[PDB]
Design an enzyme around this catalytic site. Structure first.
Site, PDB file in Angstrom:
ATOM      1  N   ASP A  46       0.814  -1.190   0.000  1.00  0.00           N
ATOM      2  CA  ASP A  46       0.000   0.000   0.000  1.00  0.00           C
ATOM      3  C   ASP A  46       0.859   1.255   0.000  1.00  0.00           C
ATOM      4  OD1 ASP A  46      -1.807   1.898   0.291  1.00  0.00           O
ATOM      5  OD2 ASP A  46      -2.778   1.033   2.056  1.00  0.00           O
ATOM      6  N   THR A  47       1.095   1.815  -1.184  1.00  0.00           N
ATOM      7  CA  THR A  47       1.920   3.002  -1.289  1.00  0.00           C
ATOM      8  C   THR A  47       1.277   4.238  -0.687  1.00  0.00           C
ATOM      9  OG1 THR A  47       1.097   3.439  -3.527  1.00  0.00           O
ATOM     10  CG2 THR A  47       3.099   2.134  -3.324  1.00  0.00           C
ATOM     11  N   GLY A  48      -0.033   4.188  -0.461  1.00  0.00           N
ATOM     12  CA  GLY A  48      -0.734   5.274   0.200  1.00  0.00           C
ATOM     13  C   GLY A  48      -0.712   5.253   1.720  1.00  0.00           C
TER      14      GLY A  48
END
Ligand SMILES: C=C(F)CO[C@H]1CO[C@@H]2OC[C@H](OC(=O)N[C@@H](Cc3ccccc3)[C@H](O)CN(CC(C)C)S(=O)(=O)c3ccc4nc(NC)oc4c3)[C@@H]21
Ligand SMILES: [Cl-]
Ligand SMILES: [Cl-]
Ligand SMILES: [Cl-]
Lengths: 99, 99
Positions: free
Chosen positions: B25-27
């Site tokens: 999850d890059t967010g």
């Protein structure tokens, strides 16, 4: 480009005639933006994340540009604390995770 | 590997000798796992997401394998809807976004 993850991966998008900043977010199924006007039909939706759910308006077939990359897709609009670009649009610009 | 985004980027992780599934999850700034036991002392943290905030337990210097890649770092534990691997550990395994 190759985008580092040392910092939040923020990019400029162009949507509905506006320029906005948004987070490239592989953990988001959907693109969710703060309140704004978009043309055309919409339907209400609930989406859920850490903390629970928010109500959004779902607009389909919306043109967007991210880093020179044009795409079209669904945009959810509502009280998100931050603009996120989700997988539905990340795929269209050819974005992958690599390690 | 190279992971496209047509489906959720779910991978297998290993923590405390056990396999779990988690979302890359890059967010997410941080890594947050569903309720589980970890060793040592924890510290309080609030983390904010789409629907508001949750309280979590912060454990530091925890060994965790992500798709076979070894990391050791901070893991948050609390009532998250899904296990997420955030940038704190994505950076340890050399992950970038590319398009
Ligand atoms: C099926 C549901 F109930 C909710 O679905 C989520 C996943 O796909 C949908 O697209 C938009 C929304 O996606 C997310 O909120 N994704 C989040 C991950 C997630 C995935 C599934 C369930 C809950 C959370 C997102 O990638 C990470 N989130 C922050 C984004 C919104 C800026 S997060 O989960 O709130 C998060 C995670 C780790 C964090 N570490 C910190 N440190 C301060 O803050 C954090 C916030 C819907
Ligand atoms: Cl779409
Ligand atoms: Cl592809
Ligand atoms: Cl860490």
């Amino acid at each position: 480009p190759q985008i580092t993850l040392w910092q939040r991966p923020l990019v400029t998008i162009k949507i509905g005639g506006q320029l906005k900043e948004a987070l490239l977010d592989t953990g988001a199924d959907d693109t969710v933006l703060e309140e704004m006007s978009l043309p055309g039909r919409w339907k209400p939706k609930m989406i859920g994340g850490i903390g629970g759910f928010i109500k959004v308006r779902q607009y389909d077939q919306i043109p967007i540009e991210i880093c020179g990359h044009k795409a079209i897709g669904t945009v959810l609009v509502g009280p998100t604390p931050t603009n996120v670009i989700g997988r539905n649009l990340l795929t269209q610009i050819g974005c992958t995770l690599n390690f």
